[PDB]
Amino acid sequence: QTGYLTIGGQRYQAEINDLENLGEMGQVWKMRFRKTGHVIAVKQMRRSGNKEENKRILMDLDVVLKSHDCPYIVQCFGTFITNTDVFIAMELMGTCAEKLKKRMQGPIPERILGKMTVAIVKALYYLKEKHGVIHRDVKPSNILLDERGQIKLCDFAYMAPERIDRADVWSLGISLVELATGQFPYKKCKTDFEVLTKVLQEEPPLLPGHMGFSGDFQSFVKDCLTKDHRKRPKYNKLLEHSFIKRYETLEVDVASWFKDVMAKT
Ligand SMILES: *CCC(=O)N1CCC[C@@H](n2nc(-c3cn(-c4ccc(C(C)=O)cc4)nn3)c3c(N)ncnc32)C1
């Protein structure tokens, strides 16, 4: 559907002029619905833009509109189609995990990465089983969080060893090591090919053992960083890992932690 906004459970007859532009975020606009006061994220696709960009934007929007039943994927509130533009209203999140790392200026606690791991794995498992989509780029910039504790996947250096000669599991492990240590494991590489050489030649950058990380966390990262892809576990096997099982039920106040980090300059 187009020309309608669905915030919560109320559908609103809306047009693009019913939204107030509050500025650009990081092209995704922050806009306010004048009829209710809701602030939403709006992605603008110009019909005169690049054909390559508009091709993938329409492709992911197809998946986004099909992912209304997944609580770990950014939801679409509606679309506005004009004679020159396509505005995609999206659920407004707080910030991405990469900004949280830079704002923290240090490692992100394991309990936060535990809830983050459960959310991201279930999002990737949803894209594969129900949509046949394999998200070929999982990184902290694609992991979104808000002030209510939600952790969702955004869009659809981290390439798996076999993707060069499943593959997304390797990208999640690299992201977990980067957030758990505050250091990108391939930060000393100048070119993209130098990162490539170290992934195949060097041992997997595992989690350090002197930071109080639980054995379940280090085991989950080691399983994600398996160089031989034939021995890398499935999402079916990952979802039963004790690290996933712990944070599927453990109460972690991600909302309060998110506010505390955002309250720093
Ligand atoms: C670290 C991440 C970061 O800084 N960002 C860049 C600036 C915008 C930030 N941000 N993105 C979203 C967002 C984007 N999408 C999205 C929807 C559809 C498609 C396609 C290709 O169809 C692509 C992206 N959904 N959500 C944000 C939201 N929703 N809230 C807050 N900030 C957001 C990411």
Whether the CB-CB separation of 261 and 100 falls below 8 Å is answered with: yes
- Cβ(222)–Cβ(177) below 8 Å: no
Other beta carbons less than 10 A from residue 145's beta carbon: 26
Q: Edge-to-edge, what's the strand order for the sheet holding 143-145? A: 95-96, 143-145, 151-153
The CA distance from 73 to 70, in Å, is: 6
DSSP H helices in 36-151: 51-66, 97-104, 110-131
Looking at the DSSP bridge assignments, the partners of residue 6 are: 11
Cα separation, 82 vs 66, whole angstroms:
22
Ligand 1 atom with the smallest distance to the CA of 97 is 1
The string of DSSP letters for 86-106 reads EEEEE---SEEHHHHHHHHTS
Domain 94-265, classified CATH 1.10.510.10, yes or no: yes
Asked if 169 and 238 touch (Cβ cutoff 8 Å), the reply is yes
CA distance 76 to 64: 7
137 is catalytic: yes
Taking the alpha carbons of 214, 215, 221, 224 in that order, is the dihedral positive or negative?
negative
Q: Name all residues whose Cβ lies below 6 A of ligand 1.
A: 25-26, 28, 41, 43, 56-57, 60-61, 64, 74, 88, 90-93, 96, 98-99, 141, 144, 154-155
Q: What angle do CA 229, 137, 116 make, to 5 degrees?
A: 90
**CA-based nearest residue to 149, from 263, 260, 258, 264:** 258
Q: What is the CA radius of gyration of the chain?
A: 19
CA–CA separation, 125 vs 47, rounded Å?
A: 33
CA distances from residue 104 to 108, 213, 256 in whole angstroms, order as listed: 7, 18, 14
- Residue partners of 115: CB distance under 8 A and separation at least 6: 149, 151, 247, 252, 254
Q: Where in the chain is the domain with CATH 1.10.510.10?
A: 94-265
* Helix 167-181 and helix 215-224, axial crossing angle in degrees, nearest 10: 140
Q: What is the resolution of this structure in A?
A: 2.1
Residue 121 in marked binding region: no
Nearest ligand 1 atom to the CA of 90 is: 29
